[model samples]
Target: SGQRWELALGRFWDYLRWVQTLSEQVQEELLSSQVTQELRALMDETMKELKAYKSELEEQLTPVAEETRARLSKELQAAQARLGADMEDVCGRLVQYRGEVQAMLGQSTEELRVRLASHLRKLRKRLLRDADDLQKRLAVYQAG
Candidate 1:
């Protein structure tokens, strides 16, 4: 099996030898005194062609890249605007809820001192549990 693979590779080497022979002739012609001016002109023409092609490619790609960047930026701004609005709505609801809770406390003024203390303890426990649950959910999501 190994000798078979090596023999197959030897054919490739034979093809490369033929290519190198042709390349050597081309190299000799390139270094000839008669073609010196022609070689300089060819080099200059190739450089100009390369630069022109590069500029054309950039011209075609620039507008598309810019448009994509602008669209992404606009989408980001819209997302931030929506988030801001949602945050404001949640804050407004929280303020309203606090006012209702305060009124409830006021109505239970019969056991004012005891009810006040008990209400505070219950509120603290509920709020802490809600916040801790939120934190746990956030951590799980982030870990994922």
Candidate 2:
């Protein structure tokens, strides 16, 4: 009976040590799992805060962006108008210059034609007089 009691007591101490080891393992697993959950929560909160800051900055800049766009649009329109007016003025001057050049060319062509016709008439008269004088000289030589 004493030997049987000693064996039972040893078995009970072994069971108690096994239960303690299981408890420690369970505690370690719970801590590891909770750490991951806490890290995820912290990341989520930080993302939300960053999003709010971005929204606030956008709100503050919206009016300035709009005003800058409006000013640039007005300046572009004014520059376009100025360019248009300058182009119109330049086209008008070009047209007037073309008209003047055409008038000068026409007048010069008419004067050239008149001078050429007069010079041709003078050449024809001189040729006819020379031919008549040669014929008279030839007739005198034949009679002698």
Candidate 3:
């Protein structure tokens, strides 16, 4: 069928995006290339990251059982259980957005994903430590 992508320039830099016959040549070569696997992995891995993030935040809150489990005199239902739903909904929006530009993105390696993941992990740990520091300082203020 041969659909066209218009193909952004200055990234991969091998040529043959809008060319006539060699364009197909690039596709054929790419069809069996290692970049193909990485490209697919990037798509799935992005959603995988989102799923992990949602579950990570969702796990922060402990759930206690209430009677009836639904619409039953809503007394102590103020712990923001619906926040996970918002995150889950937001995650789907990310997936929908990725649909538009996945073809354009290429050449990301697992090495880089790990690097970024570690950096992101560092940020989270820094946030946790700061929160803990704030808690301790506030308590220390009362200790005097």
lDDT of 2 by residue, 1-144 (tens): 223322332343343233223244523432244422433343344334433433343443323456564564454335334433332332333334335445675454344334433543453344334323423332232222
lDDT of the candidates, in the order given: 0.37, 0.37, 0.32
lDDT of 3 by residue, 1-144 (tens): 110110111111122112112233533443344333433343344334434443443344334444432322131122122322332332343233234334437653344334434543443344335433433432322212
Q: Which regions of candidate 1 fall more than 4 Å away from where they truly are?
A: 1-63, 108-144
Q: List, residue by residue over 68-106, the lDDT tens digit for candidate 1.
A: 645644543353344333323333433443345466754
All candidates: TM-score? 0.28, 0.26, 0.26
Q: Which stretches of candidate 2 lie over 4 Å from their true place?
A: 1-66, 105-144
What TM-score does candidate 1 reach? 0.28
Candidate 2 residue-wise lDDT at 80: 34
For candidate 3, which ten residues in a row score worst on lDDT? Answer: 1-10
Q: Give the range of the ten consecutive residues with the poorest summed lDDT in model 2.
A: 135-144
**Candidate 3 residue-pair clash tally:** 0
Clash count, predicted structure 2: 0
